[PDB]
């Protein structure tokens, strides 16, 4: 378990009316990498969802602080806002 | 529309004919309703 | 307005219906005449020699 700051500037590569979606993907990929786990095993708590979609589908926050914990037999992570 | 009693009887019959060939007929004849109709794909008379 | 597809959408009138006398869906409910058997037009049954090859 640890607190990490996810940069979401790469969502700018996706068309602007769909930035929120891409953000949620970048978040999952960031945690999967930094916590050494499969993207399939990363659980994003709705709090994170609401944070990224706060200004609608076309406006994402530039970064987001997220608190994630890593555990269990198969290796998985649970994440949430902070 | 407005259906008369006769029209209704005819529609009723068409609904009834529009059924499966009983399974036992399958066995008895040791091996299809060629008059199967669909309300959308088909058009009834009258 | 085209005579094709756009004009087909206006067709919701009922004309030919099941005939009381012959059973064919040919009884024109507005003319009250069967285009198939002649019901409403003649007591005799609608018939013509041209409905078959001349020598048959």
């Amino acid at each position: 378990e640890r607190v990490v700051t996810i940069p979401l500037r790469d969502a700018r590569a996706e068309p602007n009316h769909k930035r929120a979606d891409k953000a949620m993907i970048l978040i999952r990929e960031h945690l999967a990498k930094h916590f050494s786990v499969d993207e399939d095993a990363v659980r994003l708590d709705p709090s994170i969802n609401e944070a990224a979609w706060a200004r609608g589908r076309a406006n994402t926050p530039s970064k987001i602080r997220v608190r994630a914990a890593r555990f269990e037999e198969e290796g998985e992570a649970i994440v949430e806002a902070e | 529309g407005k259906k008369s009693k006769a029209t209704k009887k005819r529609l009723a019959k068409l609904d009834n004919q529009n059924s499966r060939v009983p399974a036992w007929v399958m066995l008895k004849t040791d091996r299809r309703n060629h008059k199967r109709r669909h309300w959308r794909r088909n058009d009834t008379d009258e | 307005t085209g005579a094709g597809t756009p004009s087909q959408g206006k067709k919701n009138t009922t004309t030919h219906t099941k005939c009381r006398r012959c059973g064919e869906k040919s009884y024109h409910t507005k003319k009250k005449v069967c285009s198939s058997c002649g019901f409403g037009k003649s007591a005799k049954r609608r018939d013509y020699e041209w409905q078959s090859k001349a020598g048959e």
Binding site: - | K8, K9, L11, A12, K13, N16 | -
Partner: protein
């Protein structure tokens, strides 16, 4: 010569009408009037028919909903057939 009553119409809805409103339901000849349905019923099960509602069904038959007088008990009438 056609008879008036064809057979009892037995379904979930029919049973409810029987348990909650003292009504019996019948499949009857579609040429029969409400009155002819009332008489026929009174003469077949000896009861007092109070009201009869009819419907020409999409099955080609006529369905009758017969309400008996408070004197009679549908549940019991239907139970003897």
């Amino acid at each position: 010569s056609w008879d008036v009553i064809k057979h009892p119409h037995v379904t979930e809805k029919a049973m409810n009408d029987m348990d909650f409103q003292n009504k019996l339901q019948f499949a009857v000849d579609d040429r029969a009037s409400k009155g002819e349905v009332a008489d026929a019923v009174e003469e077949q099960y000896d009861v007092t028919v109070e009201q009869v509602n009819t419907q020409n069904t999409m099955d080609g038959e006529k369905k009758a909903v017969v309400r008996l007088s408070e004197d009679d008990d549908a549940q019991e009438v239907a139970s003897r057939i």
